Amino acid sequence: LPSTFVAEKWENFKTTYARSYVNAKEETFRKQIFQKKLETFEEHNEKYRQGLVSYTLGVNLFTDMTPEEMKAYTHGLIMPADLHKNGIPIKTREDLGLNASVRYPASFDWRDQGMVSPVKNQGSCGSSWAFSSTGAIESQMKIANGAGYDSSVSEQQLVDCVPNALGCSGGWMNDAFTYVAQNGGIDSEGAYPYEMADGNCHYDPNQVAARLSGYVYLSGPDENMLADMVATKGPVAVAFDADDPFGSYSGGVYYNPTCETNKFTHAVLIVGYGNENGQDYWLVKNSWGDGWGLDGYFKIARNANNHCGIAGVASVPTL
Structure with a gap:
C-alpha cells in the first residue's frame, strides 16, 4: 500500500477513534501496528475476492491495538x-x-x-x-x-x-x-x-x-x-x-x-x-x-x- 495512502488512512483513524498519541515513539509504535494490520486486510480481502475465504477484514477500534489490549x-x-x-x-x-x-x-x-x-x-x-x-x-x-x-x-x-x-x-x-x-x-x-x-x-x-x-x-x-x-x-x-x-x-x-x-x-x-x-x-x-x-x-x-x-x-x- 502507498505510504501517503496509509498516512491518510492513519490520520483518519486517529481522528475517528479519538487516539491520543503524545510523542513520536508512541506514534511510530501504534502506526506500525496499524500499517501491519492494513497489509493483512489487503492480503485477506484479496483471497476473499478470489473466493478463497468467505469474509472480509477491515478497520475498526482494534486496528492499532496490541493482543494484550484486545x-x-x-x-x-x-x-x-x-x-x-x-x-x-x-x-x-x-x-x-x-x-x-x-x-x-x-x-x-x-x-x-x-x-x-x-x-x-x-x-x-x-x-x-x-x-x-x-x-x-x-x-x-x-x-x-x-x-x-x-x-x-x-x-x-x-x-x-x-x-x-x-x-x-x-x-x-x-x-x-x-x-x-x-x-x-x-x-x-x-x-x-x-x-x-x-x-x-x-x-x-x-x-x-x-x-x-x-x-x-x-x-x-x-x-x-x-x-x-x-x-x-x-x-x-x-x-x-x-x-x-x-x-x-x-x-x-x-x-x-x-x-x-x-x-x-x-x-x-x-x-x-x-x-x-x-x-x-x-x-x-x-x-x-x-x-x-x-x-x-x-x-x-x-x-x-x-x-x-x-x-x-x-x-x-x-x-
Missing part, C-alpha cells in the same frame, strides 16, 4: 466447573414445547420484529458474558411486552454482583442468569449504569427492570435445534472461539479453518440465521459498539460442524 474484548470469558448451574436442558423439540414435523422459516431475523435492543459497547472490560446475558434478557422483555418496550438492563450489576463470576476479568452467562433469578431481579441500565470497571455490588431491589424464573440451555451442539430455539424462544446467548483475526471481521460470513469447537472466549447473542453465497450463517449481535462489523453485528458459518463452537453453549433466559 484480550479484554475477545477473550474475557471464564468457563466455570458446572457449565449450566440450575439450567433446564433442551434435548428435543418437545422440550421447547413444540410439535413434531412443523417447520420454521429457513431464514429469520429478530430485528424484523423489533425484538433486539440497540448494540452496546463493553469497552476495555472483559464483560462480554454480561452483555450477552443482558442482551438476551432484553430481547425476552421485548418479546413479552412488545417491540417498542424500553428494555435496557444493568451489565454493571452482573459485573459487581454475580458472586462467582470474576467481573471485568471474566464470567459466564448461565451464572448470570441463575444469579438474576435468585436475586429477585436485575436493575435498569439507568438505575445502575455501566462503569467499564469492577465495582462493589449496590443492587437496588426497588429499581428492578426484569425478573427471570430461570433459563434453558441447548444440551448439545445441534445447529438445527438451535435454529428452532432462535425462531421460537428468542435470541440465544452463545459463546465461541474469537481468536484473531475475528476481531477485524468487517463483513461476509466468518469461517476460520483453525477455529476450535471447544474454546469459548467470547460471549455474544444469536438474533437470527440465513444463507448467503452458498453458505448458511448465524446472524449475531456483538457488544463492541455499533461501529464494529456490520453495524455491531456479524455473520458466522452455520451447519459447518459447530464452527468455532457457536452451538456449544447456547442458552435463553426464561422470564
Whole structure:
C-alpha cells in the first residue's frame, strides 16, 4: 500500500477513534501496528475476492491495538466447573414445547420484529458474558411486552454482583442468569449504569427492570435445534472461539479453518440465521459498539460442524 495512502488512512483513524498519541515513539509504535494490520486486510480481502475465504477484514477500534489490549474484548470469558448451574436442558423439540414435523422459516431475523435492543459497547472490560446475558434478557422483555418496550438492563450489576463470576476479568452467562433469578431481579441500565470497571455490588431491589424464573440451555451442539430455539424462544446467548483475526471481521460470513469447537472466549447473542453465497450463517449481535462489523453485528458459518463452537453453549433466559 502507498505510504501517503496509509498516512491518510492513519490520520483518519486517529481522528475517528479519538487516539491520543503524545510523542513520536508512541506514534511510530501504534502506526506500525496499524500499517501491519492494513497489509493483512489487503492480503485477506484479496483471497476473499478470489473466493478463497468467505469474509472480509477491515478497520475498526482494534486496528492499532496490541493482543494484550484486545484480550479484554475477545477473550474475557471464564468457563466455570458446572457449565449450566440450575439450567433446564433442551434435548428435543418437545422440550421447547413444540410439535413434531412443523417447520420454521429457513431464514429469520429478530430485528424484523423489533425484538433486539440497540448494540452496546463493553469497552476495555472483559464483560462480554454480561452483555450477552443482558442482551438476551432484553430481547425476552421485548418479546413479552412488545417491540417498542424500553428494555435496557444493568451489565454493571452482573459485573459487581454475580458472586462467582470474576467481573471485568471474566464470567459466564448461565451464572448470570441463575444469579438474576435468585436475586429477585436485575436493575435498569439507568438505575445502575455501566462503569467499564469492577465495582462493589449496590443492587437496588426497588429499581428492578426484569425478573427471570430461570433459563434453558441447548444440551448439545445441534445447529438445527438451535435454529428452532432462535425462531421460537428468542435470541440465544452463545459463546465461541474469537481468536484473531475475528476481531477485524468487517463483513461476509466468518469461517476460520483453525477455529476450535471447544474454546469459548467470547460471549455474544444469536438474533437470527440465513444463507448467503452458498453458505448458511448465524446472524449475531456483538457488544463492541455499533461501529464494529456490520453495524455491531456479524455473520458466522452455520451447519459447518459447530464452527468455532457457536452451538456449544447456547442458552435463553426464561422470564
